Design a protein around this ligand. Structure first.
Ligand SMILES: CCCCCCCCCCCCCC(=O)SCCNC(=O)CCNC(=O)[C@@H](O)C(C)(C)COP(=O)(O)OP(=O)(O)OC[C@H]1O[C@@H](n2cnc3c(N)ncnc32)[C@H](O)[C@@H]1OP(=O)(O)O
Ligand SMILES: COc1cc([C@H]2SCC(=O)N2c2cccnc2)c(CCCN2CCN(C)CC2)cc1O
Length: 382
C-alpha cells in the first residue's frame, strides 16, 4: 500500500472490504527448521525469565526502549513481576520468549513474545497466539530488524502447529479488524497537570479541577470485596457467559482465569460483588502499569491503572466502574485508563473520562473476516 514487509504476509490489504471468514492461506505441512539470519554481530537467544538476571535485562530493554506517547514525554515501565505474569501464563513455551543479543557484549537489543490463547472470532474458535513486547533498541531502529523478529516468531509458532495470531498496535498496518480509542480518567489532577500529561482548562481553575475529579473515600456497592481462591470458578462462569455477546473474545480455561484474575499486588486487582445471599454476581478488574516521565527532574513516574474485564449481571456497570475509580484512587493511582471496547462507551463520558491521542488497532494474522465496531471487541491485552 505500499508495505515492503506487510505486503508479503498472509493478511488482507488495506481498503479491501472483506465479506468472507477464514484463513488467508492453508496450514503449512513443512516448516523451515533453521532460524532466520540476523545482521552480522547479532545472535538469537531464548530468554529464561525464571532467571532473575535475564528478567531484569528484559525489564531494562523495555524500560529504556519500549512504547512512548506521541509527544515523546512518557514511556511504559512494565515491572519485572508484571512481565512474569504477562509472559508465563498457562501453556507458555520457552522458545516463544525470543531475544536478540550483541554477540560480543551480550547486550540485549531486541525482543518479541508469543503466548498461547484460544480465540473466538465470530462463529469460529481457533487456537492462536498473542504477540506482544516487540522491541528494538533505539540505536538499532530503521534497519529492518523488526521484520526478522516477526518472521522468526512466526516460524517458531508454526513448529507448534499454530497458524493464526492476534495482536494490537498504535500504528496502521494491513488490516485492522477493529479500531479502539484510549480514554483517561484523572485521579490526581494536580500531578497530571504538573507533569503535563494533562492541561488546565482556560475555563477551569485548579481548585475547580480538583473538585470536578474528587471521589468518595470508599466504594458504594454492597458486598464488594477482593477476589479469593474460592471465587475462581464463579469468576470463570461469569466471564464466559458475559463474553458471548462480543465478536472477538478470549476463551479461557479455569486455570487461565486463576492466572489472569487472582489478585497480585502491584500487578492485577480483581474485586467481586458477593450479595446478601452469599452469591458472587459481578466483578471488576484492573492491571497496574506505571509510566516513566522522560527527562523530568522531580516527577519520575506516573502510576496508571488499566481497565481489564468488567462483568455485570446484577450491579449496574456504571456503579461497578465508579467503584473501580474509587479503589484505584485508594491504591494511589494517578490516572485510570480504559478503551472504548465492550460496553465501555456507556460509562466513559458519565464518569468524566476524557479522550486521548491515538488509536489502538486490533489485528489478526492469517484470518480474513469482516471488521467490527469497538463495541463488538471483547479482548483486552497487556
Ligand atoms: C502464526 C503466528 C504468527 C505470529 C506473527 C503475528 C504478527 C506479529 C506482528 C507484530 C505485533 C507486535 C505487537 C506489539 O508488540 S505493538 C508494540 C511495538 N513496540 C513498540 O512500539 C516499542 C518502541 N518501538 C519499537 O521498538 C519499534 O521501532 C519497532 C520494533 C516496532 C519497529 O522497529 P523499527 O522502527 O526499527 O522498524 P524496522 O526498520 O525494523 O521495520 C519496519 C517494518 O516494521 C513495521 N512495523 C513498525 N511497527 C510495527 C508494529 N508495532 N507491529 C508490526 N509491525 C510494525 C513497519 O510498518 C515496517 O514494515 P513495512 O511498512 O515495511 O511493511
Ligand atoms: C500522553 O498521553 C498518552 C499516553 C499513552 C501511552 S504511550 C507511553 C505511555 O506511557 N503512555 C501512557 C502514559 C501515562 C498514562 N497512560 C499511558 C497513550 C497510549 C497510546 C499509544 N501510542 C499511540 C500510537 N503510538 C505508536 C505512540 C503511542 C495515549 C496517550 O494519549
Amino acid at each position: 500500500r505500499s508495505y515492503q514487509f506487510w505486503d508479503t504476509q498472509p493478511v488482507p490489504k488495506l481498503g479491501e472490504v472483506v465479506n468472507t471468514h477464514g484463513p488467508v492461506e492453508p496450514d503449512k505441512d513443512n516448516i523451515r527448521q533453521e532460524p532466520y539470519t540476523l545482521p552480522q554481530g547479532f545472535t538469537w537467544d531464548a530468554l529464561d525469565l525464571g532467571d532473575r538476571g535475564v528478567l531484569k535485562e528484559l525489564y531494562t530493554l523495555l524500560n529504556e526502549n519500549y512504547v512512548e506517547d506521541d509527544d515523546n514525554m512518557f514511556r511504559f515501565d512494565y515491572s519485572p513481576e508484571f512481565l512474569l505474569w504477562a509472559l508465563r501464563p498457562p501453556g507458555w513455551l520457552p522458545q516463544w520468549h525470543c531475544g536478540v543479543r550483541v554477540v560480543s557484549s551480550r547486550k540485549l537489543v531486541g525482543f518479541i513474545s508469543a503466548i498461547p490463547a484460544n480465540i473466538h472470532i465470530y462463529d469460529t474458535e481457533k487456537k492462536m497466539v498473542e504477540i506482544n513486547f516487540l522491541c528494538v533498541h533505539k540505536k538499532l531502529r530503521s534497519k529492518r530488524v523488526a521484520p526478522v523478529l516477526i518472521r522468526e516468531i512466526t516460524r517458531r509458532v508454526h513448529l507448534e502447529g499454530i497458524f493464526q495470531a492476534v495482536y494490537t498496535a498504535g500504528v496502521v498496518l494491513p488490516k485492522p479488524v477493529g479500531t479502539c480509542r484510549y480514554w483517561h480518567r484523572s485521579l490526581n489532577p494536580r500531578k497530571l497537570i504538573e507533569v503535563k500529561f494533562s492541561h488546565l482548562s482556560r475555563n477551569m481553575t485548579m481548585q475547580r479541577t480538583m473538585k470536578l475529579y474528587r471521589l468518595p473515600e470508599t466504594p458504594k456497592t454492597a458486598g464488594l470485596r477482593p477476589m479469593e481462591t474460592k471465587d475462581i470458578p464463579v469468576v470463570h462462569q461469569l466471564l464466559t457467559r458475559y463474553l458471548k455477546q462480543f465478536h472477538l473474545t478470549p476463551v479461557m480455561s479455569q486455570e487461565e482465569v486463576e492466572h489472569w484474575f487472582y489478585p497480585q499486588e502491584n500487578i492485577i486487582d480483581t474485586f467481586v460483588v458477593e450479595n446478601a445471599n452469599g452469591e458472587v454476581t459481578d466483578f471488576l478488574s484492573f492491571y497496574t502499569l506505571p509510566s516513566t516521565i522522560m527527562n523530568h527532574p522531580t516527577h519520575k513516574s506516573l502510576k496508571a491503572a488499566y481497565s481489564f474485564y468488567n462483568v455485570h449481571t446484577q450491579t449496574p456497570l456504571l456503579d461497578l466502574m465508579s467503584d473501580a475509580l474509587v479503589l484505584a484512587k485508594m491504591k494511589g493511582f494517578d490516572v485510570f485508563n480504559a478503551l472504548d471496547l465492550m460496553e465501555n462507551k456507556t460509562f466513559l463520558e458519565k464518569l468524566k473520562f476524557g479522550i486521548g491521542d491515538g488509536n489502538l488497532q486490533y489485528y489478526l494474522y492469517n484470518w480474513k473476516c469482516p471488521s467490527m465496531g469497538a463495541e463488538k471487541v471483547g479482548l483486552v491485552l497487556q
